[PDB]
Amino acid sequence: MLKAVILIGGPQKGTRFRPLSFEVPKPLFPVAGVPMIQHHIEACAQVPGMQEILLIGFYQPDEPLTQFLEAAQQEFNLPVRYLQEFAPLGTGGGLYHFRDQILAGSPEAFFVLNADVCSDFPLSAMLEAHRRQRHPFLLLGTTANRTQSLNYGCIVENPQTHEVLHYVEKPSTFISDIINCGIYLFSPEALKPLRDVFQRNQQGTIRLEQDVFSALAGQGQIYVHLTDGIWSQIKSAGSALYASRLYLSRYQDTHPERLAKHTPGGPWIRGNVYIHPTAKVAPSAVLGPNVSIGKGVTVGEGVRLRESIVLHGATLQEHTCVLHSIVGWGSTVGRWARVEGTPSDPNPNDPRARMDSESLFKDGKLLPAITILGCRVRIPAEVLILNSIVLPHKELSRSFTNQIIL
Amino acid sequence: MKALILVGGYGTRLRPLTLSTPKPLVDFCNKPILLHQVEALAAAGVDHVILAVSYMSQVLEKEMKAQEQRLGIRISMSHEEEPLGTAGPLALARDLLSETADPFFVLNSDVICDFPFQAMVQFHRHHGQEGSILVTKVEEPSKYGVVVCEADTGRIHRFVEKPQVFVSNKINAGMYILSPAVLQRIQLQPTSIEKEVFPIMAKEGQLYAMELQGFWMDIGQPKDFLTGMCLFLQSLRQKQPERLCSGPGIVGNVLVDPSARIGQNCSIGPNVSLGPGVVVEDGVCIRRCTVLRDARIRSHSWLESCIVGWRCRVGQWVRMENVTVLGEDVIVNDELYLNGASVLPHKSIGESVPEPRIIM
Numbered sequence: 001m002l003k004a005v006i007l008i009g010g011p012q013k014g015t016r017f018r019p020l021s022f023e024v025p026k027p028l029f030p031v032a033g034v035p036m037i038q039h040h041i042e043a044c045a046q047v048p049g050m051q052e053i054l055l056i057g058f059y060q061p062d063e064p065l066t067q068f069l070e071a072a073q074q075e076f077n078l079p080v081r082y083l084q085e086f087a088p089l090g091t092g093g094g095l096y097h098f099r100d101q102i103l104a105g106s107p108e109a110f111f112v113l114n115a116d117v118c119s120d121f122p123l124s125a126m127l128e129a130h131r132r133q134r135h136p137f138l139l140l141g142t143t144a145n146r147t148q149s150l151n152y153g154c155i156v157e158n159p160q161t162h163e164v165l166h167y168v169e170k171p172s173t174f175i176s177d178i179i180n181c182g183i184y185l186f187s188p189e190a191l192k193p194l195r196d197v198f199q200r201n202q203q204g205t206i207r208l209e210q211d212v213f214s215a216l217a218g219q220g221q222i223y224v225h226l227t228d229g230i231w232s233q234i235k236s237a238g239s240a241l242y243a244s245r246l247y248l249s250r251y252q253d254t255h256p257e258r259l260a261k262h263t264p265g266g267p268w269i270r271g272n273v274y275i276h277p278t279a280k281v282a283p284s285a286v287l288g289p290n291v292s293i294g295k296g297v298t299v300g301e302g303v304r305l306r307e308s309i310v311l312h313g314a315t316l317q318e319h320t321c322v323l324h325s326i327v328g329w330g331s332t333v334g335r336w337a338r339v340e341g342t343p344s345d346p347n348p349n350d351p352r353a354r355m356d357s358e359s360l361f362k363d364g365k366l367l368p369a370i371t372i373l374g375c376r377v378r379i380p381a382e383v384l385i386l387n388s389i390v391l392p393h394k395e396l397s398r399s400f401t402n403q404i405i406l
Numbered sequence: 407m408k409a410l411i412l413v414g415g416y417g418t419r420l421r422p423l424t425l426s427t428p429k430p431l432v433d434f435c436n437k438p439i440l441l442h443q444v445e446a447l448a449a450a451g452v453d454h455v456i457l458a459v460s461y462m463s464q465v466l467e468k469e470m471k472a473q474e475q476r477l478g479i480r481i482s483m484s485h486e487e488e489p490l491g492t493a494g495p496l497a498l499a500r501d502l503l504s505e506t507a508d509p510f511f512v513l514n515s516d517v518i519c520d521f522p523f524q525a526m527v528q529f530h531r532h533h534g535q536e537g538s539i540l541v542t543k544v545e546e547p548s549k550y551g552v553v554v555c556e557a558d559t560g561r562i563h564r565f566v567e568k569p570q571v572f573v574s575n576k577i578n579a580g581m582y583i584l585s586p587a588v589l590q591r592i593q594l595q596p597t598s599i600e601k602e603v604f605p606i607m608a609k610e611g612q613l614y615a616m617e618l619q620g621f622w623m624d625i626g627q628p629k630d631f632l633t634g635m636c637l638f639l640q641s642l643r644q645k646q647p648e649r650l651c652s653g654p655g656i657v658g659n660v661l662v663d664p665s666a667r668i669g670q671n672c673s674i675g676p677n678v679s680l681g682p683g684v685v686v687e688d689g690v691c692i693r694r695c696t697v698l699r700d701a702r703i704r705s706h707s708w709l710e711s712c713i714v715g716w717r718c719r720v721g722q723w724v725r726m727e728n729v730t731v732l733g734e735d736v737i738v739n740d741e742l743y744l745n746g747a748s749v750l751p752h753k754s755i756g757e758s759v760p761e762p763r764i765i766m
């Protein structure tokens with residue numbers, strides 16, 4: 001028997017996702033058409049012997065979260081429960097606080113997945129490596145650039161036994177090119193160190209990386225499993241576009257019916273395109289590489305869509321060019337309008353990928369990044385929105401370049 | 407009665423158009439500007455004009471000799487091997503203007519207006535002195551040199567290059583009537599006439615000033631080219647309104663050459679002049695743009711305030727705003743954005759230009 005614990009965040013963790021996280025929680029944001037933790041629930045339900053999927057977070061249970069829970073329980077034939085913490089307890093404090101609900105039924109192991117990662121999720125390879133070695137902590141790690149590794153949690157390991165000897169969460173110097181993927185496999189024995197950490201706080205909030213991983217490294221309890229699959233961290237609102245690109249590439253092997261094909265009565269399609277069946281796309285439109293369309297989306301004639309996410313209810317009128325953008329829920333773009341962003345991907349292999357701070361700014365200047373329209377944003381006709389963030393329920397009247405429209 | 411026209415001498419403004427064809431030979435509302443000047447000139451009744459050219463301009467020779475045949479008036483060709491400026495042209499063709507003691511027009515090339523030639527002649531005969539200038543109103547006195555006018559005579563007192571004093575509203579309009587004694591004063595050297603020769607005969611007070619009523623623009627500048635194209639389509643709307651093309655997807659004052667093609671389902675907005683042989687495709691919005699001849703604008707593009715050069719190929723979903731002048735044979739790739747891009751001829755653009763800069 002196996003279990004899966006998906007550590008979704010809370011409303012404070014979604015503030016960096018801010019113009020999209022104003023209407024729906026950041027875990028329920030659709031990357032490549034389905035919500036971002038439905039990829040985790042998909043991959044965990046594919047593992048044989050998986051009995052339960054628990055979601056630990058401090059979101060209050062509202063209608064989108066409970067509707068997603070019912071839909072996931074019906075779709076994947078598995079109990080998907082939401083354990084709500086009484087306070088933000090960190091990444092390890094929710095695992096220690098819900099230890100009786102996690103260890104109920106005595107599982108052999110339980111996965112611990114951070115909800116903001118986009119991975120190919122090699123849970124079966126990781127599980128079998130654990131079934132051979134049977135250590136308390138198993139980490140998923142991937143190789144990164146030497147400049148990019150200072151953004152992520154570096155893992156210094158011994159290559160013979162694959163045992164991590166050092167862990168630094170954000171080192172100022174290069175210590176390792178292997179970074180932590182946010183996918184873990186825990187033995188039941190792994191809830192025994194967390195307790196000790198909790199007792200050291202009493203002589204509540206446990207950070208799993210700083211208090212458990214960095215402190216127990218080199219003592220034979222934490223081990224690494226290295227993969228070469230796709231991996232990304234969805235932190236800001238524009239990172240979901242790169243995660244969408246990766247997931248649409250993954251759909252060529254995983255869900256080939258989800259990608260859209262060339263149809264004689266349909267639109268032109270380049271690259272990997274997801275179109276929802278409820279969405280009505282005009283045949284004169286062309287939908288370029290890495291485009292996701294949601295339900296009830298009207299796409300007019302002559303619409304160019306490239307590297308974009310169009311959320312549900314949005315309307316693009318005729319001859320509208322949308323590049324590197326996220327078009328919010330119910331937000332309408334008028335005719336001959338151009339919604340353009342500059343490509344900015346958070347990949348740990350690109351040397352001049354960006355350094356991914358909380359600040360969207362530099363020297364007063366807003367950095368050129370993905371154009372994000374919030375929900376119910378009205379873009380007028382023949383108006384350019386370039387490199388801009390538009391907050392929800394905004395009606396614009398002129399062109400805006402490199403701004404944050406409050 | 408004769409007329410000298412000042413042309414050639416490489417217009418440094420609107421330089422992406424000037425680099426291919428000369429500045430009097432680029433098309434202003436499906437017609438070259440020198441054609442406009444000499445057609446209104448021949449409607450005045452001047453039997454021969456002289457145009458004075460320092461740049462070697464063989465296609466200007468070509469078109470001008472063909473239009474000698476077309477118009478019925480003679481055209482004389484004063485050829486200049488150094489730049490003589492704008493007074494030196496009067497002194498190089500000075501014996502042809504000393505043939506007959508009768509006052510002659512001197513015209514600048516870059517000016518478009520409604521040309522009041524016989525009223526100018528009536529005014530020059532009324533005031534009875536050496537030189538008559540044309541003046542106009544400009545709202546912006548901090549850009550051009552001002553000229554002081556007393557009422558009911560129109561005599562100059564002084565001529566001021568510099569702005570920012572507010573001694574006058576009136577600006578030089580690029581039209582002069584000069585007597586042969588003025589040309590007697592002009593010397594062979596490359597001096598310009600309005601810097602020195604007009605100042606001294608304004609100091610003696612020989613110079614008089616005649617006022618236009620409306621619609622003047624010098625189009626030596628690309629933004630002034632587009633503003634003068636707007637004003638010319640205004641004047642064309644309330645002078646010959648059946649010459650502008652009307653339609654269901656046509657807004658405002660739009661001039662379309664009969665060789666031009668406009669696709670289905672596209673909105674040609676106000677103040678647009680499409681040249682001969684232009685192919686506007688399906689779903690293109692064009693407002694305030696001047697598209698010169700043989701240029702093809704592909705589908706779903708958007709164009710506001712732009713000068714599209716000869717034999718251009720604007721791609722699909724291209725947005726062009728902020729007076730981006732394309733030169734001759736410029737190929738803009740699909741899904742680009744140009745803002746202020748003065749693009750030199752024979753260029754291929756594959757990157758968006760987000761702020762005004764020159765592409766070479």
Ligand SMILES: Nc1nc2c(ncn2[C@@H]2O[C@H](COP(=O)(O)OP(=O)(O)OP(=O)(O)O)[C@@H](O)[C@H]2O)c(=O)[nH]1
Nearest residue numbers: 007008009056057088089090094114115116153182
């Ligand atoms: N339940 C719960 N989950 C949390 C909490 N804080 C963060 N998380 C989740 O834990 C995951 C990682 O949290 P972070 O603190 O941002 O860590 P990280 O920056 O992604 O670093 P790595 O895990 O090393 O890749 C995310 O999915 C968060 O949503 C919390 O207080 N409670």
Ligand SMILES: Nc1nc2c(ncn2[C@@H]2O[C@H](COP(=O)(O)OP(=O)(O)OP(=O)(O)O)[C@@H](O)[C@H]2O)c(=O)[nH]1
Nearest residue numbers: 412413414415417418419458459460489490491515
């Ligand atoms: N033929 C001759 N024509 C000249 C010469 N210099 C200037 N011109 C003409 O003088 C007229 C008025 O001068 P400008 O208004 O300054 O025009 P421009 O010489 O084209 O200079 P810009 O328009 O600022 O580029 C123009 O029609 C020119 O063609 C010259 O050296 N030789």
